[PDB]
Amino acid sequence: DPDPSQLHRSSLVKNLQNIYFLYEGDPVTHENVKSVDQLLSHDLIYNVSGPNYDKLKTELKNQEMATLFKDKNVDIYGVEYYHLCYLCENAERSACIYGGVTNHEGNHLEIPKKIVVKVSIDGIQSLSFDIETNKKMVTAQELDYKVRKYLTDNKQLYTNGPSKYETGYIKFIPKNKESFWFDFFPEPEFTQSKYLMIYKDNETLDSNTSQIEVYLTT
Amino acid sequence: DPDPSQLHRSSLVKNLQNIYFLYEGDPVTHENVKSVDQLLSHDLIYNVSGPNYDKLKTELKNQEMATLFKDKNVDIYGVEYYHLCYLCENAERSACIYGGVTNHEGNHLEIPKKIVVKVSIDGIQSLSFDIETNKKMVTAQELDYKVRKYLTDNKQLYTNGPSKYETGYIKFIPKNKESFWFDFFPEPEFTQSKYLMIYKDNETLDSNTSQIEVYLTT
Amino acid sequence: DPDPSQLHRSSLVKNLQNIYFLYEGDPVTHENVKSVDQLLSHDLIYNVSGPNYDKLKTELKNQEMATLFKDKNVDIYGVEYYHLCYLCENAERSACIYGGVTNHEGNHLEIPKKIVVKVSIDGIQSLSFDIETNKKMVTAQELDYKVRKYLTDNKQLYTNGPSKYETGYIKFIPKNKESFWFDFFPEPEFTQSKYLMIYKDNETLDSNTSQIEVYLTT
Amino acid sequence: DPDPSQLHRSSLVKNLQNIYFLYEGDPVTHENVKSVDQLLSHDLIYNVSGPNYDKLKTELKNQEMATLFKDKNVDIYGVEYYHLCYLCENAERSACIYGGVTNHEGNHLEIPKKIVVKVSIDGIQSLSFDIETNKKMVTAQELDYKVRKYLTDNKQLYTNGPSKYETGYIKFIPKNKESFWFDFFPEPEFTQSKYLMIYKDNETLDSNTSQIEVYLTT
What we know:
4 copies of one chain form a homotetramer. By secondary structure, chain A is of the alpha+beta class. The first copy, chain A, has helices at residues 17-24, 63-69, 140-155, 192-195, and strands spanning 28-34, 43-46, 55-59, 73-78, 94-98, 101-103, 108-121, 124-135, 137-139, 167-173, 180-183, 204-206, 211-217. Chain A is globular, with a radius of gyration of 17 Å. At the C-D interface, helix 1 of C face helix 1 of D. Chains A, B, C, D: Belongs to the staphylococcal/streptococcal toxin family. Chains A, B, C, D: It comes from Streptococcus pyogenes.
């Protein structure tokens, strides 16, 4: 578990709104789509449209993972960025994400699984809410975005300026796997593209057995 | 005027939507704003916010024009682009425009000195609508966007796909000055940052005494 | 002819060494090559190599100029730049130039033609030197490069720092064609890609009837 | 150690010469220098020159490492790249590297320690040679380059085209510490800037108690 020393201080961050706009906006979501191209051996390019893009590139873990989803119909759920997301200098309206991929066939639920998020602020676990997913195997990114979105709208985790909290992080607890975590704040000088690397491994958890804990300090 | 041939054929332009998205959307408009920085000698950077940018860079004719508006209160009105709009890796969420700058102090009309636009579909002077601005001195770019947004929203000038027309252009007839015209369609393979260079010379005209002529074909 | 007030001052330029490296290094030269691709409608891409590049893109005046040289065997001569020369994100070892393209078939001389350059410094043209070429129809860019290459090495026109001259321009006087000139110095804050735009028109002159004059001041 | 399946096949790589150029040319070496700037919190910018560059930005592991070397007098030994080395988006002549940073104070040797490299080919120990450094603690990058530069020149590990070997990796064996290896070949579609990330950790070994082994297959 994170030691207080290695947690990013939100007050040191210059341009914290750049994170706010990543988690305040809508995520890119598409279902039953298939890769159409590749730039590097570890990414995949989809022909999908959303507001602000008509092409989507996702960067996976390595070439092994990419070629695994290459000819499969998948679902994409991710947090995109547009700056530093080039395809060929001639392809405008492009969007980029890390991971956010899972197989379409056989991964949906007719009735969605609600995960109850245990949020703790300043040591006291004074908050809890449910998040939702209709996927059996869901990426940590989809659940992460959903938690931050709620905390943003309701508890002002992020605002178009400073944040309400100094430090904070989310922790996923898989049943048979090792628990991992993400820091809600980036380094003082950062980039959306570098911060979102936390999604590159494309870690997917079983929505039926996983737990989520959030820890924030004022 | 142009020799009906050198004009650009919409049918040949692949990825026409990219043009459409530039005029179908809202323009960038700010009043009584002052330049705050500069990347190259002929551009000016403003700290203005929009639903996609936190900074706006405007490229002007030459360093002389830029040094002219550098420390003045102006009105900005242009069509911004994002792909290939770089200030530095540490300045994402930036928008770029060409010209679109006018003096603010003394240049407003208590009442919009509306200008009449006479269209001409296939030679036969067909349609004719009304444009309007409350600027004594207004840039051709501002009037050109107003003239295009309309023709789009009501005559399908551009669409999320192809165009109702093959060729087409706008002719600007200033009182005492040579008359210019902008081609409505780009080259088959274009870029938004390259096509918007038609606003780079920051050509401003008198709203009170000037006429616009739009032509088209099918 | 330029007015003294219009010439850019070298003392005002920051990072002038960036121009120095442009004209002190070797130019990119290739003979009898054919365009292998194309990015935008007005450029051409060649699969040619040199130290630092395995691909070369040349930007011409417009699409008419581009489509004219497309399927032809041309000769290339230009001053290349790398920063802001993007091909498709994974096209490392790529170079960019403006124009510098001439037809290959029947445009060469058995014996190189010598062209005298009259170099006037502070109003006194007490210097003359030689420039050579084996092209009948040569580009201004090729002659201009050869001039500055000689002036840099012999007269310290450019150095890895300041220039020995405040101003200076090259004037090309073609036989029965109007003369043109290029300013040796850029605006204070500049980029290599924007300054080299002087060659974009691909202006070519007759090496038999063309004269060159260089005006410098200290 | 890597299971043969784990190693990248060189025959599958498109543009394997982009690797060749990285290790055939001279590295960027600078001793006793101090960082003058910073773009992102995990990088350091140095005002040092070499051919093709006037600025050098080194990307380290995280912000702690960067702040750790920030104001110290360091030595730099790295393998640079230029494509995608975005700095100010108006700063040409920049070279980028990863790590390759060691403290200058109290780290040199009177006599350069020589390290023996054992090269096994197709499983048979077939060649041993010498590499040398004047540093007590040296980056794995420095030694890696030294090893590869020798094997390239003498055994055609890489060439401007294909390589003699199908797979190959280098194994660093420190005294008290776990060993680690670097694959000599990249994924089929790679980028110099992504491939060179094997040096981001800035791992440094003791030049007096470390061994190097190289395994190649044809």
